Design a binder for these strands. Structure first.
Ligand SMILES: [Mg+2]
Ligand SMILES: [Mg+2]
Ligand SMILES: [Mg+2]
Ligand SMILES: [Mg+2]
Ligand SMILES: [Mg+2]
Ligand SMILES: [Mg+2]
Ligand SMILES: [Mg+2]
Ligand SMILES: [Mg+2]
Ligand SMILES: [Mg+2]
Ligand SMILES: [Mg+2]
Ligand SMILES: [Mg+2]
Ligand SMILES: [Mg+2]
Ligand SMILES: [Mg+2]
Ligand SMILES: [Mg+2]
Ligand SMILES: [Mg+2]
Lengths: 87, 203, 137, 142, 34, 91, 92, 125, 58
RNA sequence: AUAAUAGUAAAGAUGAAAUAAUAAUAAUAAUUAUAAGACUAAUAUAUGUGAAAAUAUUAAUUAAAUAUUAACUGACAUUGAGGGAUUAAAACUAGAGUAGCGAAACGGAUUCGAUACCCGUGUAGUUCUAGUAGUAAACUAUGAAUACAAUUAUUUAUAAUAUAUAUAUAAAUAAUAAAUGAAAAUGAAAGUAUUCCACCUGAAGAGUACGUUAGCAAUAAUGAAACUCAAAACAAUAGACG
């Protein structure tokens, strides 16, 4: 395959390391409830427990629960990982 | 000379290959030479390679491709799972025989194809195995059903008298959790070097 | 000429070869004649490219000029080889006026020819004069 | 005869304005085989409701902007519902990637195009491009 | 030449062009018949 | 019951490993994934749209060498063949 | 006529371009998303946008070169970061 | 000089489609042979639908019959043949293209080469 | 000189042999090739009237 | 652009608006159907190819083109004043052509003003055929040739290897060592050397004037002096500023 060697750079770093967390439980419950209400009319008792669960989740605050060292490794290992020729 | 010593020596003994350490395709046999250390040598990071290996590695076994690369790191993976598969197979004690009517290759320009088995089993088929309870006719081995069954580091074809609904249909695609017993009938080996086992589900 | 062939073939030789093949087959008519005709058509100069004709002309020139059989690179034979190409190149230009790259190429070729005749004159004057006379210069 | 085979919903969504168009594919049931096949391939169309977002009272600049496009789409859907061109299947097509295109699709998805969606057999884009062709205007300095 | 230096040259060239434009009728008069 | 994306089906003749059952294995598999490559000039296939259409996007565009993964010369030959095809009726 | 009837819109399916998809009645939105993806792959909106104005041929060539460079840099960066990740994983 | 040909002929008649094609093949083959030429192979191809509704002068076409004629000729000849093809009303698209004989003498059609058979000897066997 | 002469002549001979082989191959082939009208007609009949081996891919 | 179909009040434009061969004479959008020019989406990297200008829809013709072998010639070479040929865009002279674009011009906006930037009509021009002319940031801002010098990674081609391996060659491209350099940086040349040609000798005045030659012309080449200054220029540094 076609390899692509970069030139000598000042500093290898990602400008925004994503630390892809899991989505919020409360938000999920809210979406589920919304989905249920799309069917079954406005407020039928099929989604009786779901609403209660949502309420329990969003009692103290609107969301329930409230970084990746990636550019601490790039910076560290750039000089090694280079194919930069000798001095 | 030095050259002769180098040719003899333990790094020259490891036959070179540039096969992927990460191969997500079908694995029918070992790709790379497994390399162990002693505990003492691990403690001072020495594996008998060009360089020291990172102190993050606490496993005694590994696999490698390059002693040193342009990236200034040895290309390795700290795992030696293939030895354990072989040892499991040995424990199971089901002797591999060619289902096709042919002589055993170990008895009697170059052929790169696999000579009989690849050396996972040098066992001969004619033996029985006695115990306190008696002479073992049926080899009992625990395995997991996937959907085929994973039986001691090998996937194996399975057969039964009646398909049990209580165990299967209760957890349709979480059958992997529950370990079931198996009766291994025989092990054949195809041209590609895959071990085609055949088991029977016991209840 | 009428029964001249491309691809370094000769019509007399081809017929003989065909006859030999026929004899071999017999050992081991109209249709055969038709096949022979088809072969001739395939290998004729007039169905083939101009390039083959040029090559043939160059070979002929070499044969004429070679001071011994292996002759290729004799200053005179080189000049002769150049001439055939020049003639063809000149003809091409006459068809195609504004083809300036190929006019340049022609120019270079005649400059090269001049240079090699100049050399020949220094080396071996009588031979050079003879060559010139042959080429019409 | 004049049998309506299917309807085609066309939406040209330029920078400054949208153009929504509904049209019936009118096949006649009633010569050479090749000619007949050609006729079958390209059935004549008749326009039923044309619409542009100025028709909904959006003047000058506001007609280039989504909300207006969405409203126009909703109006179109209402017209389709009322005027009774919902018996046969529908074919959606688009042009020119405006804001209004985004509006139209959203309207179709939602409750405003609820009755129409079930008849919509195929969506199929047909934006025009050029392989060289006429030179475009000089790129404005601003 | 930097761009700044070039700009003086450009200006000079423009002035020259202007002068030529101005002195077209005069130049014509001078040229014909002498 | 569960979807197909979150469970690696180990093949019949293959070996496996404890790791191989994991989520991480599946992720790794997801991460890591022809006649023109075989060694025959693509300019034989200019009367064979069926085969040339494989090296073309749904609309009709020719695919880039990054995508198709060819030798540069072989790619250019393929492209030529395609262009010849569309000059003719066929393709 | 009979022959035409027998040919039940066979050509109509293959004649049309790739900018066309059959909608599943359960999910029109999904179909629309798929279409959009297809359009993106074919670069049709970007082409349309490019074609609104004229750009001098040398200038567009320069732009194209710059884009290519940017592309090659990005995959060089990707390669580098993958190596960095591997090193991190191992211990280096 | 071996020139391959690809003509997409007209098919007006529904029941007997190949007749016009066959006539075309006859005529062009006759022309070739009259003018020092040698037709080697006349590979038929199917009644294949055109990609778009392709149109000749005051006509339209959606399906056609396709064929290759793999003949030898002079350059001049080939050009004349091409002109005659362009001219006639019963072909939609025509395309002559050279097959290079600098290396070989026996060369099969492009399709046969793509399949595997380089020379016509292979096809025969 | 002798060696050089041999080298010159051997290559030429080889080339000649190759040309002869090519000619022989052409001759072998040429029953399929067409010159006359009747042969052409026969070929046409074989191609079209049989309704067999139309080169179409699937 | 014209015409037909059905269809309804706006359409087109812009930062926002208007003017206009826009539209209640029935448009715009849509679907068809004719014609006309001019352009060439992807592939594409201008990779490559060409002396340089240049050069990517297809085909054919004629021309020229790579490498390695074999044989031959026997220094026939290098560079090249003068000279010669080709030389983008604009321009010009004829004769066709003229869709789109578009100097100018006119009109609408913008603005204190707006001989502009934006919008609308849109003539020269852009297109072809035959010429003239011989200039561009015609740039790699780097004349051509030969011998040589430390590494690595990429491709490309060549040979062997026992067709797919790891090897030997070249070639290019990218990082450098040394060396050179005012530094920026050059890196097989901006290094080490040899050969040949072109050209420079403060800034202004000036590539101006006069003269001559060439051109249908615009112009092109050639190319001074007086007068006036101790200036004028480049690389890099640190700020301030946007
Ligand atoms: Mg010379
Ligand atoms: Mg305009
Ligand atoms: Mg300077
Ligand atoms: Mg040069
Ligand atoms: Mg292109
Ligand atoms: Mg003119
Ligand atoms: Mg204007
Ligand atoms: Mg002009
Ligand atoms: Mg001239
Ligand atoms: Mg000038
Ligand atoms: Mg200069
Ligand atoms: Mg550099
Ligand atoms: Mg120096
Ligand atoms: Mg210097
Ligand atoms: Mg002057």
């Amino acid at each position: 395959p076609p390899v692509y060697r970069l030139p000598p750079l000042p500093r290898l770093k990602v400008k925004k390391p994503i630390i892809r967390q899991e989505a919020n439980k409360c938000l999920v419950l809210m979406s589920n409830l919304l989905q249920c209400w799309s069917s079954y009319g406005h407020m039928s008792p099929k989604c009786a427990g779901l609403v209660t669960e949502l309420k329990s989740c969003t009692s103290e605050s609107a969301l329930g629960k409230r970084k990746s060292n990636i550019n601490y490794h790039a910076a560290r290992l750039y000089d090694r990982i280079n194919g930069k020729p000798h001095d | 000379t030095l050259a002769e010593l180098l040719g003899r020596s333990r790094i020259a003994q490891v036959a070179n290959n540039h096969k992927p350490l990460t191969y997500t395709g079908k694995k029918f046999h070992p790709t790379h030479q497994i390399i162990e250390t002693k505990p003492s040598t691990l403690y001072r990071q020495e594996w008998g390679l060009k360089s020291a290996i990172p102190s993050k590695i606490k496993s005694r076994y590994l696999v490698y491709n390059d002693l040193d690369t342009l990236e200034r790191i040895t290309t390795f993976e700290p795992r030696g799972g293939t030895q354990w598969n072989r040892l499991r197979f040995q424990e199971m004690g089901v002797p591999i025989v060619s289902n096709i009517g042919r002589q055993n290759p170990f008895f009697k320009k170059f052929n790169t194809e696999i000579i009989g088995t690849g050396g996972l089993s040098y066992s001969l088929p004619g033996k029985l195995k006695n115990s306190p309870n008696g002479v073992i006719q049926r080899t009992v081995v625990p395995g997991r059903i996937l959907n085929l069954a994973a039986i001691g580091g090998f996937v194996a074809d399975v057969v039964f008298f009646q398909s049990p609904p209580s165990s299967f249909n209760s957890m349709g695609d979480f059958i992997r959790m529950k370990t079931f017993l198996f009766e291994i009938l025989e092990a054949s080996m195809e041209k590609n070097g895959s071990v085609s086992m055949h088991a029977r589900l016991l209840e | 000429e009428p029964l001249v062939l491309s691809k370094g073939y000769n019509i007399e030789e081809v017929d003989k070869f065909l006859a030999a093949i026929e004899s071999a087959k017999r050992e081991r008519i109209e249709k055969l004649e038709d096949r022979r005709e088809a072969i001739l058509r395939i290998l004729s100069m007039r169905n083939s490219e101009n390039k083959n004709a040029i090559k043939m002309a160059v070979e002929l020139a070499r044969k004429e000029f070679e001071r011994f059989p292996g002759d290729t690179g004799s200053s005179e034979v080189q000049a002769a080889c150049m001439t055939v190409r020049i003639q063809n190149m000149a003809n091409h230009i006459k068809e195609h006026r504004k083809d300036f790259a190929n006019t340049r190429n022609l120019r270079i070729l005649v400059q090269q020819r001049q240079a090699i005749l100049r050399y020949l004159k220094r080396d071996n004057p009588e031979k050079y004069y003879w060559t010139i006379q042959k080429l019409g210069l | 005869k004049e049998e309506v085979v299917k309807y085609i919903l066309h939406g040209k969504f330029t920078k400054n304005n949208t153009h929504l168009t509904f049209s019936s594919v009118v096949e006649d049931k009633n010569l050479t085989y090749n000619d007949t096949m050609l006729y079958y391939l390209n059935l004549p169309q008749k326009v039923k409701i044309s619409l542009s977002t100025g028709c909904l009272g959006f003047r000058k600049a506001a007609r280039g902007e989504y909300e207006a496009a969405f409203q126009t789409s909703g109006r179109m859907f209402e017209l389709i519902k009322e005027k009774n061109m919902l018996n046969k299947d529908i074919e959606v097509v688009m042009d020119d990637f405006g804001k209004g295109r985004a509006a139209f699709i959203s309207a179709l998805v939602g409750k405003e195009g609820a009755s129409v969606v079930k008849k919509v057999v195929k969506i199929s884009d047909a934006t025009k491009l050029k392989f060289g062709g006429v030179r475009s205007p000089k790129m404005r300095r601003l | 030449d930097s761009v700044m230096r070039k700009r003086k040259k450009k200006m000079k060239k423009h002035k020259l062009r202007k002068r030529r434009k101005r002195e077209k009728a005069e130049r014509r008069k001078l040229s014909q018949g002498r | 019951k569960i979807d197909q994306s979150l469970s690696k089906k180990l093949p019949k003749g293959t070996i496996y490993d404890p790791f191989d059952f994991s989520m991480g294995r599946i992720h790794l598999d997801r991460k890591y994934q022809d006649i023109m490559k075989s060694g025959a000039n693509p300019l034989e296939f200019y009367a064979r749209p069926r085969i040339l259409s494989r090296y073309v996007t749904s609309t009709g565009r020719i695919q880039h060498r990054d995508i198709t993964g060819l030798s540069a010369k072989n790619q250019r030959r393929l492209s030529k063949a395609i262009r010849r095809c569309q000059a003719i009726g066929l393709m | 006529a009979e022959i035409a009837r027998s040919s039940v819109e066979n050509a109509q399916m293959r004649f049309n371009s790739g900018k066309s998809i059959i909608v599943n009645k359960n999910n029109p939105a999904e179909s629309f998303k798929r279409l959009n993806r297809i359009m993106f792959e074919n670069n049709i909106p970007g082409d349309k946008r490019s074609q609104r104005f004229y750009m001098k041929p040398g200038k567009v060539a320069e732009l194209k070169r710059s884009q290519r460079h940017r592309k090659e840099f990005m995959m060089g960066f990707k390669r580098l970061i993958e190596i960095v990740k591997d090193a991190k994983r191992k211990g280096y | 000089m071996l020139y391959e040909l690809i003509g997409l002929v007209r098919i007006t008649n529904s029941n007997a489609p190949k007749l016009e094609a066959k006539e075309l093949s006859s005529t062009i083959g006759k022309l070739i042979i009259q003018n020092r030429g040698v037709v080697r192979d006349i590979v038929p191809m199917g009644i294949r639908y055109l990609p778009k509704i392709m149109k000749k002068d005051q006509e339209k076409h959606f399906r056609a019959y396709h064929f290759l004629m793999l003949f030898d000729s002079s350059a001049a000849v080939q050009s004349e043949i091409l002109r005659t093809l362009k001219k006639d009303p019963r072909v939609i698209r025509s395309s002559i293209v050279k097959v290079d004989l600098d290396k070989q003498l026996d060369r099969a059609s492009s399709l046969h080469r793509s399949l595997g058979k380089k020379s016509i000897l292979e096809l025969v066997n | 000189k002798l060696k050089r002469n041999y080298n010159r002549s051997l290559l030429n001979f080889q080339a000649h042999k190759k040309k002869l082989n090519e000619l022989l191959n052409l001759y072998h082939v040429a029953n399929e090739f067409i010159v006359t009208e009747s042969q052409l007609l026969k070929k046409i009949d074989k191609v079209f009237n049989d309704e067999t081996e139309e080169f179409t891919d699937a």
